[PDB]
Amino acid sequence: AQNPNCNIMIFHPTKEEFNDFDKYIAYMESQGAHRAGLAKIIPPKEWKARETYDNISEILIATPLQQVASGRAGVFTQYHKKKKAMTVGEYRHLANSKKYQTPPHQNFEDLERKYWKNRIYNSPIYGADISGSLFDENTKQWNLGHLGTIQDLLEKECGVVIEGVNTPYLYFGMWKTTFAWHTEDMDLYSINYLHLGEPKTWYVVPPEHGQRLERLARELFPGSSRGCGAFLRHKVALISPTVLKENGIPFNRITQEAGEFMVTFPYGYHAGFNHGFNCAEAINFATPRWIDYGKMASQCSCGEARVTFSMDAFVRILQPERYDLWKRGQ
Ligand SMILES: [NH3+]NC(=O)Cc1nn[nH]n1
Ligand SMILES: [Cl-]
Ligand code: NA
Ligand code: NI
Ligand SMILES: [Zn+2]
């Protein structure tokens, strides 16, 4: 068995290997990459996403979200307070202001330590989930707005035609902006490209061990757990690497830099934080290997997790016994 310790693998496809997206995801899985829950893909040197990021400042962040924490430094929740609209240029200026700017630090490890020591004491502002794309239309390889749709994948695998659309999202980050522990909707894959700016640090639990994380989360966030049997889908809980190690939870970490792709695999729980001003693009995707995961994915039916219209068909077809209850939650 490949990658039995579930390490995060890093891949360097050639330009030729970068042509067929689906083929390369299957190749990475052949090497055991999926066992980790996350892989890094460094594009060939001949590749670029777009020509320059000089002209992005006018993009609107309609609802920037202030991420306010509650709890203790290693075990906290965050809630998203809505703020007034601003442009990407205005956001960038805010991110670089003394109130929000990355502190002086020695290296990624020193910054990580600062993050987990001091995150709760600040409330950074995040531009998330903005439908759009920064790939140029002429970029033919690894263009996150041109990948095979999940709807077509379901059709191809199981023979039925469903409604829905699958488009990418943009994210504008700043120091301390945080993504809580989660798997994707319906335990889909995700792919994430860091277009510009400062790094993003990732934590990930191997899929084969995702229930260990769930069990610790239920222990650490007892009220939330009583509220919903799939509360991690609310995307608000944070647990530090120190606390994960104290509790014996298998996990790995890696830092993504601008120009790099990260793929998350089905049922790979992940969390992390941005180092400073950045912009990323991401989208969920499927492969034939996902179908089994989709059929088995937990769902949140308490109301809190609210999701895209596209989800409906995936629950309806893959999880008919659960559909009525999930729909009520919606
Ligand atoms: N799937 N990708 C992630 O969860 C990464 C992310 N970064 N900001 N919000 N989420
Ligand atoms: Cl700090
Ligand atoms: Na490890
Ligand atoms: Ni994710
Ligand atoms: Zn819920």
Numbering used by the authors: 11 to 340
What is the paper's account of this structure, in its own sentences?
The five members of the KDM4 subfamily (KDM4A–E) catalyze the removal of the methyl group from tri‐ and dimethylated lysine residue 9 in histone 3 (H3K9me3/me2). Herein, we present the first successful attempt to obtain high‐resolution X‐ray structures of both hydrazide and tetrazole moieties bound to the enzyme KDM4D. All structural work reported herein was performed on the catalytic core of KDM4D, which comprised amino acid residues 1–342. All of the ligands (1–7) reported in this study occupy the native cofactor binding site, which is in close vicinity to the metal binding site and the site binding the methylated histone lysine.
The lead structure, compound 1, represents the molecule with the shortest distance between the two interaction motifs: only one methylene group separates the tetrazole group and the hydrazide (n=1). In the structure of compound 1 bound to KDM4D, a clear positive difference electron density for the ligand could be observed and the ligand could be modeled with 77 % occupancy. Its hydrazide group chelates to the active site Ni2+, which is a surrogate of iron. The mode of chelation is very similar to that observed in the binding of the natural 2OG cofactor.13m The aromatic tetrazole ring is sandwiched between the two active‐site aromatic residues Phe189 and Tyr181. The distances between the tetrazole and the centers of the aromatic rings are 4.2 and 4.9 Å for Phe189 and Tyr181, respectively; thus indicating an aromatic stacking interaction. The distance of 2.6 Å between the hydroxy of Tyr136 and the second nitrogen atom from the tetrazole ring indicates strong hydrogen bonding. All of the other nitrogen atoms in the tetrazole ring are connected to the protein residues through clearly defined water molecules. Superposition of ligand 1 with the 2OG‐bound structure shows high structural similarities between bioisosteres. In brief, ligand 1 was the most potent compound, with an IC50 value of 46.64±0.94 μm in a formaldehyde dehydrogenase (FDH)‐coupled assay. In the antibody‐based LANCE Ultra assay, the potency was as high as 2.38±0.37 μm.
